[PDB]
UniProtKB/Swiss-Prot annotation, chain C:
One Pfam assignment: Proteasome
Cross-link (Glycyl lysine isopeptide (Lys-Gly) (interchain with G-Cter in ubiquitin)): 112, 205
Family per record: Belongs to the peptidase T1A family.
GO annotations of cellular component type: centrosome; cytoplasm; cytosol; extracellular exosome; nucleoplasm; nucleus; proteasome complex; proteasome core complex
Statement: the UniProt record of this protein carries the keyword Nucleus: yes
GO MF terms, alphabetically ordered: lipopolysaccharide binding
The species this protein was found in: Homo sapiens (Human)
Cell location: Cytoplasm; Nucleus
InterPro entries xref list: Ntn_hydrolases_N (IPR029055), Proteasome_alpha (IPR050115), Proteasome_alpha-type (IPR023332), Proteasome_alpha1 (IPR035144), Proteasome_asu_N (IPR000426), Proteasome_sua/b (IPR001353)
Protein name (record): Proteasome subunit alpha type-1
PROSITE patterns: PROTEASOME_ALPHA_1 (PS00388), PROTEASOME_ALPHA_2 (PS51475)
Organism classification: Eukaryota, Metazoa, Chordata, Craniata, Vertebrata
Keyword DNA-binding on entry: no
Role of this protein: Component of the 20S core proteasome complex involved in the proteolytic degradation of most intracellular proteins. This complex plays numerous essential roles within the cell by associating with different regulatory particles. Associated with two 19S regulatory particles, forms the 26S proteasome and thus participates in the ATP-dependent degradation of ubiquitinated proteins.
Swiss-Prot record, chain E:
Transmembrane segments: none
Protein name: Proteasome subunit beta type-1
Subunit description: The 26S proteasome consists of a 20S proteasome core and two 19S regulatory subunits. The 20S proteasome core is a barrel-shaped complex made of 28 subunits that are arranged in four stacked rings. The two outer rings are each formed by seven alpha subunits, and the two inner rings are formed by seven beta subunits. The proteolytic activity is exerted by three beta-subunits PSMB5, PSMB6 and PSMB7. Interacts with SERPINB2. Interacts with RFPL4A.
Keyword Coiled coil on entry: no
Gene: PSMB1
Curated annotation (Swiss-Prot), chain F:
Glycosylated residues, chain numbering: 185
CDD domains in the record: proteasome_alpha_type_5
UniProt entry tagged with the keyword ATP-binding: no
InterPro entries for the chain: Ntn_hydrolases_N (IPR029055), Proteasome_alpha (IPR050115), Proteasome_alpha-type (IPR023332), Proteasome_alpha_type_5 (IPR033812), Proteasome_asu_N (IPR000426), Proteasome_sua/b (IPR001353)
Family: Belongs to the peptidase T1A family.
Modification type Phosphothreonine: residues: 48
GO CC entries: cytoplasm; cytosol; extracellular exosome; extracellular region; ficolin-1-rich granule lumen; nucleoplasm; nucleus; proteasome complex
Induction or repression: Up-regulated in colon cancer cell lines. Up-regulated in fetal Down syndrome (DS) brain (at protein level). May be the target of the transcriptional activator NFE2L2.
The protein, known as: Proteasome subunit alpha type-5
Tissue expression: Expressed in fetal brain (at protein level).
GO biological process annotation, one example: proteasome-mediated ubiquitin-dependent protein catabolic process
NCBIfam families xref list: PRK03996.1
Keyword Phosphoprotein: yes
Organism: Homo sapiens
UniProtKB/Swiss-Prot annotation, chain G:
Sorted UniProt keywords: Acetylation, Cytoplasm, Host-virus interaction, Nucleus, Phosphoprotein, Proteasome
Stated name of the protein: Proteasome subunit alpha type-3
Quaternary structure note: The 26S proteasome consists of a 20S proteasome core and two 19S regulatory subunits. The 20S proteasome core is a barrel-shaped complex made of 28 subunits that are arranged in four stacked rings. The two outer rings are each formed by seven alpha subunits, and the two inner rings are formed by seven beta subunits. The proteolytic activity is exerted by three beta-subunits PSMB5, PSMB6 and PSMB7. Interacts with AURKB. Interacts with CDKN1A. Interacts with MDM2 and RB1. Interacts with the C-terminus of TBXA2R isoform 2. Interacts with DNAJB2. (Microbial infection) Interacts with HIV-1 Tat protein.
List of residues that carry N6-acetyllysine: 52, 201, 225
MF terms (GO), sorted A to Z: ubiquitin protein ligase binding
Subcellular location: Cytoplasm; Nucleus
General function of this protein: Component of the 20S core proteasome complex involved in the proteolytic degradation of most intracellular proteins. This complex plays numerous essential roles within the cell by associating with different regulatory particles. Associated with two 19S regulatory particles, forms the 26S proteasome and thus participates in the ATP-dependent degradation of ubiquitinated proteins.
Domain of life (superkingdom): Eukaryota
Phosphoserine: residues bearing it: 238
Annotated source species: Homo sapiens (Human)
């Protein structure tokens, strides 16, 4: 039993491994998520592949239940074990109380696991942050984020990853209510964000939606070029 | 007792009490309590030396650090 | 330096500065004085507070019908050894159906607290327990230390500015094996009135007194009932 | 008590395991030895000098049998050798209790090498400081393997360890071929020990064991003195 | 082979008064065909306002008594106050259930006051279930004792019976009559009658001799 | 370069516990007032983004129908202590069929407050206010990262804690009432907070001898704002 | 530096400074002496009076392990009485397992191995104690053992530890322990500490004497009051 | 003999340092410094001087002559939180 304290307090009251892990998140790939009223939409950017290799294994978007989708950033290895424990837990809710899992409950599970994981012995904290989107029972779609300290935190829209504060400035500087009027308009807002982010000329974006009653759906790169085509078209006539 | 000679010393002193509450000192620090008590007597502007002058001189010669410690006992 | 980090490391002089720093925390707390008569044991505490709206921090804790203590240091370790103290009373009361001898208890306390003073990464306990109790031999006043070297005495004082109270106990200790509670307790109040700044002394909310009696259960006296004892004392001379 | 539960061997910024690199130097300071297989069995030969005349050379041994048909020598330090020797002595028995068959030499080398690599990764220990030479004629054909402190292994035709092995491998390169015999490997083994030996090579400056189809055995100083005789 | 249980006799009785409580029991400890002693009370003053009666296996009565007396001081040092009666029943029910797979061979009745100066009787099975009652008999002759108190106390099976509350003296002569009436037929009914009385002022005791067959 | 986790100061106290005392100053400010009419309680939210949903975060959380809490400093660690408090009260009711008193809850958490070590890992970065109504009427307690707990009457914990205590001793007295306690608290909050006060920056919760624990919402809250 | 921290690290010339430091802490304890007479063992402890506020009979540096085995200590009092606890428990293991009283050669062996056990690890420290053991047997005479902080024991006709170790043992060898029946041993053992710890160093001291032999019927107990009052009667003849 | 400690100011010494370094620059009048001292728990007067002299440069950023409270806020996150990686203080608090 390797009993050693790792997370210790600074002489001015800080947690060095925590704030270094937030830098490890801060160099991760940029992921953007918003919510609609009837259809939620989120997508990662910067696939950065070799442009001749398979990639279904590099998909950084998965589901926990039918109504629970989840994306993340940071380092890839620590995320998926948290995903697996989340799948065991959300399945165990249905082994208990018959309803599907509420997204607030599952984020309290993940953040609550993460904090005591920082409290344990001989453990570096997790180096991931995640955006979790779920349309619960009675049709109230919402989302949360997860700090590596483990503070669950709701939003109307958010974006983490490398180069995220300027993207957040684009989202507050562009988000209205009438932007959430149409679903393809909201997708045009997301592609306006990742197009307003770092290059990603179609070949690096990967968006996925949920219509609050279906499963997740991923468009092939034809509506990426179609929606980017009408986005550059609307920007062209707007110019 | 030796370096407390050439000062206005009121009969308020208990050298047994002072030396018993002050261990781990040398002749420099024991002289230093006398001179710093001599300065604190001028800080309050009194002319003679009292016991609490030596008691505060103990604190100055020990030269502690302050961080808000009142939450004990 | 480097000889000042762990309990295991001996000094080149042979004096462990971890224990020497553990002797500071008992000097940081407030002062309290215990003493005993021929047939009674009395300890008197001096409460403190932080703000005037905040309550005063108590120090006297009832352990058993014939055992009472007083603390000086941190309340977490105080309650930690206190729960062990109550436990070691009631279990032997459960086994042998008898009260427990005080010296035999304090021996178990020293054997208890000696163990973390030798291992690796194990702090000592910062506490200054003044212990009043009854064996069949009447009153017993025991004091502790973080070095777990418990001392029998007849009157002691621990806390910040206790040495003047020790001088008062020395220059009046001959009377203590004759007088009863009514002037004995205010002799102890004459000890605690010494350790104070020159303007405030005894404003009926900063003080508590515990007495075990030769036919009397150990009773804690707090604020109101202090006022029959607190009256009838001389004014502060100047 | 309890150990330390952390490995004292990390990767360098150059990406090197510095304790294993030092352990190879500790092997390089060891006593020189060599081993040759030739078409019927393997010959192992070491170089064993007593520090004075007060010792008993008949007390301790370098050539050590492992089973009916496997012997083993080293080139390194003393007390680390005997421990993993005894470990291998156990491991052949845990093979034989399961399978009721003498162990394949390669299957022995797998388990011993796994012990060494597990031991150099396990927490709070210095790694071993020896290298081994393993012999045996299982299924007719002989075999000759060499381990290391890092835990790897190789299938040498013939090689040498200890001191001046960089010269001994050149001498074996200019000496050996495929087609020889056991006594020929004896004679060139005494030759390559004489390449870096001391002034006198008596019957007890060395220790030689051999494998056959009859199995592993160890020589006596009578015929070992007869092998040093009519040599060089 | 080695049996772990044996029966020790004894019979307890409690009646909830309006501002009082009466707990009574005999003082015979015996088993088999012989008598161990003629002095063994089952009254146990827990607090000033709580008296427990314990009948059944005597060693388990002793052990259980001492465990309860420990946990009262545990509650007091944890909570700066004494227990209440329903808190005692709520704790002791869990204590009895805590050895569900190796039970005590003990019957128990708790008498005492509420927070309002009223009697309260809590009778226990040997497992841990209970309820608040007005009067319960436990022990050997409880089958003798219950219907008489159903008639007199409960006013059952009587036409045009008015309902006066139980006065203290009528309760006293009721108990003193009914233990003699049980003593004439039970062999386990003892030779002296320990009677404990909980008031709003303290605990009163009284011992009345019986016959000594 | 790096000492142990359990090393005493040369001054004598510790290092890491005192660092945790330093750590709670970054938290949002919180004010509770004990009043014989009933204990009120208030806190800000430190609202960051318009995209942020406001009611997702909170600092008030209850333990029973008569015990509410308030937190500051680090937040993610506090939910453990809230959980142990709730479970502890349910054990006390389960075994004694009554309500555990507020001070006994407070020492029950305060025993847990200092238990880390190097066997079987660090102190906690919280600072807690306990609002409660026991049989002795209203109660109010403040504990420490060191576990030192004490009864207060009007305690202010946060970044502006000493300024609110300084402006609070001048206005508190023994015969306060609940409405002037609430309004008098929100005046101090309006002084010390950064942004403009509205019905979303803050939230309140009270406990009563008559009714149970109650938290205010955005309907019964802005009347105090317009009547500040 | 850095070679003097653990109890597992040698010095560059090959020793341990930690054990030497714990041995250095022994000479700040006051004085523990004890010799065996012809037919018994007498311990002697002088005891400094720190303040008047202590009660007489407090914090005794003189222990009682078995009915016959006696212990006098010099070091840290908590570790000393801890060693008294494990030694007393060890004798309880001996009588509980084998059915008679433990001899000193076995007892000091077990205690010395237990002391040596804390001389190997970084997890624990060595003890800061040294102490003396001695008792009487009707089948084995009287024994006298002494244990250092390192864990090495020897037999003695007499031994002395404390501050004035050499200044104590210089005068012990003037005696003739081979023939004196400890009756006069009480007075002389009293006198050889009466001549030490002067009024310059000490304010006031306290005599504390132990005593065992077949005159004590084999059992260990303290001296009676009248005999040590004859020793204090024998005190002030040393002024000549 | 004298062994003067220099520690960080509590709150009021920090506010006084704001009044020292900030008395001599064209500012918006109705700002408050006590909020800024609440935002800087552990900070030196050099760091506070870098806050004042940085926020003046935030007034020189676009085309303003008098700085504002939000210019101070744009100084605080940069100097404290963006430069918070180095910070130079904590191993010098324990002086090691």
């Amino acid at each position: 039993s390797y009993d050693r304290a790792i997370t210790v307090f600074s002489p001015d009251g800080h947690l060095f491994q925590v704030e270094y892990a937030q830098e490890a998140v801060k160099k991760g790939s940029t992921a953007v998520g918003v919510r609609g009223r009837d259809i939620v939409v989120l997508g990662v950017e910067k696939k950065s592949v070799a442009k001749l290799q398979d990639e279904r294994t590099v998909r950084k978007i998965c589901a926990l239940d039918d109504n629970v989708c989840m994306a993340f950033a940071g380092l890839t290895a620590d995320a998926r074990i948290v995903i697996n424990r989340a799948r065991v837990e959300c399945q165990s809710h249905r082994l208990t109380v018959e309803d599907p899992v509420t997204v607030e409950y599952i984020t309290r599970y993940i953040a609550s696991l993460k904090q005591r994981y920082t409290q344990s012995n001989g453990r570096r904290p997790f180096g991931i942050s995640a955006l979790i989107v779920g349309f619960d029972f009675d049709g109230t779609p919402r989302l949360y984020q997860t700090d590596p300290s483990g503070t669950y935190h709701a939003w109307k829209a958010n974006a983490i990853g490398r180069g995220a504060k300027s993207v957040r400035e684009f989202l507050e500087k562009n988000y209205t209510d009438e932007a959430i009027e149409t679903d393809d308009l909201t997708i045009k807002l997301v592609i306006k964000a990742l197009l307003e982010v770092v290059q990603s000329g179609g070949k690096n974006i990967e968006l996925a939606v949920m219509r609050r009653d279906q499963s997740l759906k991923i468009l092939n790169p034809e509506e990426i070029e179609k929606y980017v085509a009408e986005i550059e078209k609307e920007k062209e006539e707007n110019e | 007792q030796i370096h407390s000679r050439k000062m206005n010393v009121s009969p308020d002193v208990n050298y047994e009490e002072l030396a018993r509450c002050t261990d781990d000192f040398n002749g420099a620090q024991c002289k230093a309590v006398c001179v710093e008590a001599g300065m604190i007597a001028l800080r309050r502007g009194a002319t003679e030396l009292t016991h609490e002058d030596y008691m505060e001189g103990i604190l100055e010669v020990q030269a502690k650090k302050k961080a808000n410690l009142q939450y004990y006992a | 330096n480097q000889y000042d980090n762990d309990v295991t490391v001996w000094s080149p002089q042979g004096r462990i500065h971890q224990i020497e720093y553990a002797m500071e925390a008992v000097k940081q707390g407030s002062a309290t004085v215990g003493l005993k008569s021929k047939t009674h044991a009395v300890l008197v505490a001096l409460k403190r507070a932080q703000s005037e709206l905040a309550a005063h921090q108590k120090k006297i804790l009832h352990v058993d019908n014939h055992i009472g203590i007083s603390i000086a240091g941190l309340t977490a370790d105080a309650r930690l050894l206190c729960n062990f103290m109550r436990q070691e009373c009631l279990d032997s009361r459960f086994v042998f159906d008898r009260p427990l001898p005080v010296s035999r208890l304090v021996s178990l306390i020293g054997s208890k607290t000696q163990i973390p003073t030798q291992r690796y990464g194990r702090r000592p306990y910062g506490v200054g327990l003044l212990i009043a109790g009854y064996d069949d031999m009447g009153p017993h006043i025991f004091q502790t230390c973080p070095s777990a070297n418990y001392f029998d005495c007849r009157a002691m004082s621990i806390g910040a500015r206790s040495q003047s109270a020790r001088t008062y106990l020395e220059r009046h200790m001959s009377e203590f094996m004759e007088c009863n509670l009514n002037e004995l307790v205010k002799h102890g109040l004459r000890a605690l009135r010494e350790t104070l700044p020159a303007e405030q002394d005894l404003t009926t909310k900063n003080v508590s007194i515990g007495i075990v009696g030769k036919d009397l259960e150990f009773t804690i006296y707090d604020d109101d009932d202090v006022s029959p004892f607190l009256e009838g004392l001389e004014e502060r001379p100047q | 008590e309890r150990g330390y539960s952390f490995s004292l061997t990390t990767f360098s910024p150059s990406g090197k395991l510095v304790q294993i690199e030092y352990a190879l130097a500790a092997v390089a300071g060891g006593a020189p030895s060599v081993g040759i297989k030739a078409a019927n069995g393997v010959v192992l030969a070491t170089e064993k000098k007593q520090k004075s005349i007060l010792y008993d050379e008949r007390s301790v041994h370098k050539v050590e049998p492992i089973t009916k048909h496997i012997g083993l020598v080293y080139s390194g330090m003393g007390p680390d050798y005997r421990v993993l020797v005894h470990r291998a002595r156990k491991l052949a028995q845990q093979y034989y209790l399961v399978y009721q068959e003498p162990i394949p030499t390669a299957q022995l080398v797998q388990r011993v090498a796994s012990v060494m690599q597990e031991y150099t990764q396990s927490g709070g220990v210095r790694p071993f400081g020896v290298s081994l030479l393993i012999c045996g004629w299982n299924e007719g054909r002989p075999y000759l393997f060499q381990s290391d402190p890092s835990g790897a292994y190789f299938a040498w035709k013939a090689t040498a360890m200890g001191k001046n092995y960089v010269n001994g491998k050149t001498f074996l390169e200019k000496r050996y071929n495929e087609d020889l015999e056991l006594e020929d490997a004896i004679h060139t083994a005494i030759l390559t020990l004489k390449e870096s030996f001391e002034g006198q090579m008596t019957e007890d400056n060395i220790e030689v064991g051999i494998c056959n189809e009859a199995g592993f055995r160890r020589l006596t100083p009578t015929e070992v003195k007869d092998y040093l005789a009519a040599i060089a | 082979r080695f049996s772990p249980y044996v029966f020790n006799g004894g019979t307890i009785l409690a009646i909830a008064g309006e501002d009082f409580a009466i707990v009574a029991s005999d003082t015979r400890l015996s088993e088999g065909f012989s008598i161990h002693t003629r002095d063994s009370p089952k009254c146990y003053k827990l607090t000033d306002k709580t008296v427990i009666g314990c009948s059944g296996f005597h060693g388990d009565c002793l052990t259980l008594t001492k465990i309860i007396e420990a946990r009262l001081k545990m509650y007091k040092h944890s909570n700066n106050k004494a227990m209440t009666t329903g808190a005692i029943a709520a704790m002791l029910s869990t204590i009895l259930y805590s050895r569900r797979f190796f039970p005590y061979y003990v019957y128990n009745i708790i008498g005492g006051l509420d927070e309002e100066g009223k009697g309260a009787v809590y009778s226990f099975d040997p497992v841990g279930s209970y309820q608040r009652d007005s009067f319960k008999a436990g022990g050997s002759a409880s089958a003798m004792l219950q219907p008489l108190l159903d008639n007199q106390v409960g006013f059952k099976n009587m036409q045009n019976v008015e309902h006066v509350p139980l006065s203290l003296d009528r309760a006293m002569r009721l108990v003193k009559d009914v233990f003699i009436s049980a003593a004439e037929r039970d062999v386990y009914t003892g030779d002296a009658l320990r009677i404990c009385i909980v008031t709003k002022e303290g605990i009163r005791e009284e011992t009345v001799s019986l016959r000594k067959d | 370069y790096d000492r142990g986790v359990n090393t005493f100061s040369p001054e004598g106290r510790l290092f890491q516990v005192e660092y945790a005392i330093e750590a709670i100053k970054l938290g949002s400010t919180a004010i509770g007032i004990q009043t014989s009419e009933g204990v009120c309680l208030a806190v800000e939210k430190r609202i960051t983004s318009p995209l942020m949903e406001p009611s997702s975060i909170e600092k008030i959380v209850e333990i029973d129908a008569h015990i509410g809490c308030a937190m500051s400093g680090l937040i993610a660690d506090a939910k453990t202590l809230i959980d142990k408090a709730r479970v502890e009260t349910q054990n006390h009711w389960f075994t004694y069929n009554e309500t555990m008193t507020v001070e006994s809850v407070t020492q029950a958490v305060s025993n847990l407050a200092l238990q880390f070590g190097e066997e079987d890992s660090r102190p906690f970065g919280v600072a807690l206010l306990f609002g409660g109504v026991d049989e002795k009427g209203p109660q109010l307690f403040h504990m420490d990262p060191s576990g030192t707990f004490v009864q207060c009457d009007a305690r202010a914990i946060g970044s502006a804690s000493e300024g609110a205590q300084s402006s609070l001793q001048e206005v508190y007295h023994k015969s306060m009432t609940l409405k002037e306690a609430i309004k008098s608290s929100l005046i101090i909050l309006k002084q010390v907070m950064e942004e403009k006060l509205n019905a979303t920056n803050i939230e309140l919760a009270t406990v009563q001898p008559g009714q149970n624990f109650h938290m205010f919402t955005k309907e019964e809250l802005e009347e105090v704002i317009k009547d500040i | 530096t850095g070679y003097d921290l653990s109890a597992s690290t040698f010095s560059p010339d090959g020793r341990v400074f930690q054990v030497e430091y714990a041995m250095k802490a022994v000479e700040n304890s006051s004085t523990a002496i004890g010799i065996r007479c012809k037919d018994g063992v007498v311990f002697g402890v002088e005891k400094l009076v720190l303040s008047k506020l202590y009660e007489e009979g407090s914090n005794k540096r003189l222990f009682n392990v078995d009915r016959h085995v006696g212990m006098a200590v010099a070091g840290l009092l908590a570790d000393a009485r801890s060693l008294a606890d494990i030694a007393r428990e060890e004798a309880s293991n001996f009588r509980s397992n084998f059915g008679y009283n433990i001899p000193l050669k076995h007892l000091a062996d077990r205690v010395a191995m237990y002391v040596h056990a804390y001389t190997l690890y970084s997890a624990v420290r060595p003890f800061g104690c040294s102490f003396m053991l001695g008792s009487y047997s009707v089948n084995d005479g009287a024994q006298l053992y002494m244990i250092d902080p390192s864990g090495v024991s020897y037999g003695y006709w007499g031994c002395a530890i404390g501050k004035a170790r050499q200044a104590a043992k210089t005068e012990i060898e003037k005696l003739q322990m081979k023939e004196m029946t400890c009756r006069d041993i009480v007075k002389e053992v009293a006198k050889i500490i009466y001549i030490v710890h002067d009024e310059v160093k000490d304010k006031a001291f306290e005599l504390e004497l132990s005593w065992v032999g077949e005159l004590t019927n084999g059992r260990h107990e303290i001296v009676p009051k009248d005999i040590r009052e004859e020793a204090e009667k024998y005190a002030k003849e040393s002024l000549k | 003999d004298r062994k003067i400690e220099f520690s960080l100011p509590d709150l009021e010494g920090r506010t006084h340092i704001f009044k020292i370094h900030a008395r001599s620059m064209s500012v918006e009048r109705d700002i408050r410094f006590e909020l800024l001292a609440r935002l800087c728990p552990n900070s030196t007067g050099a760091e506070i001087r870098s806050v004042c002299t940085e926020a003046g440069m935030f007034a020189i950023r676009a085309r303003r002559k008098i700085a504002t409270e939000k210019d101070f806020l744009e100084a605080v996150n940069k100097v404290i939180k963006s430069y918070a990686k180095f910070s130079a203080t904590p191993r010098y608090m324990t002086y090691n």
